[PDB]
Paper text:
[name] is a small phosphatase containing 184 residues, and the sequence contains a catalytic domain as well as an N-terminal myristoylation site. The phosphatase domain of [name] consists of five twisted β-sheets and six α-helices, and the structural scaffold is similar to that of DUSP3 (VHR), while [name] does not contain an N-terminal α-helix surrounded by the N-loop.
The side chain of N128 also interacted with the side chain of D57. The DPN–triloop interaction formed but was not precise. This DPN–triloop interaction lacked a hydrogen bond between the side chains of N93 and N128, and the positions of D57 and N128 were shifted due to a spatial barrier from N93. This result indicated that the formation of the DPN–triloop interaction through S93 induced precise spatial localization to stabilize active site structure and maintain phosphatase activity.
Numbering used by the authors: -1 to 154
The structure:
Amino acid sequence: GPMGNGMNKILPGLYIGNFKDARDAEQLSKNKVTHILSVHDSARPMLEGVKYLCIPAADSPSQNLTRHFKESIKFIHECRLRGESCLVHSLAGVNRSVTLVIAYIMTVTDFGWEDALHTVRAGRSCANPNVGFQRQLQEFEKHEVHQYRQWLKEEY
């Protein structure tokens, strides 16, 4: 459905869900989620036992997510390197969150954004970034992802 069927594993230690999934203490416990990247209009820390990164971002044609790629990648990567699990969520788990996870996959693989979206959709079939975020991902692929891969190499 258009908001998924519950949070979905994308890669080990990396989940995508909707806003309800992100407050589902039982879902979070079952999946050992200790980090939440919340990217939606009213993102703010809510639950105990969870490290948050909150990015108030709209689903609107002018919303810039590229400038949040680096902090999002750092947050997800340091969680995963410690053997912990991160949930990236938005309102629907379709668009804003998927865009950040695509950027992460592009940086820890040699994938362009389309192969990264294929990877996301294998775990969460409803994943579908809008055209504005697709354009940002295409520009990231063309001009910046190679530098992000090198930064990840030097940092970790």
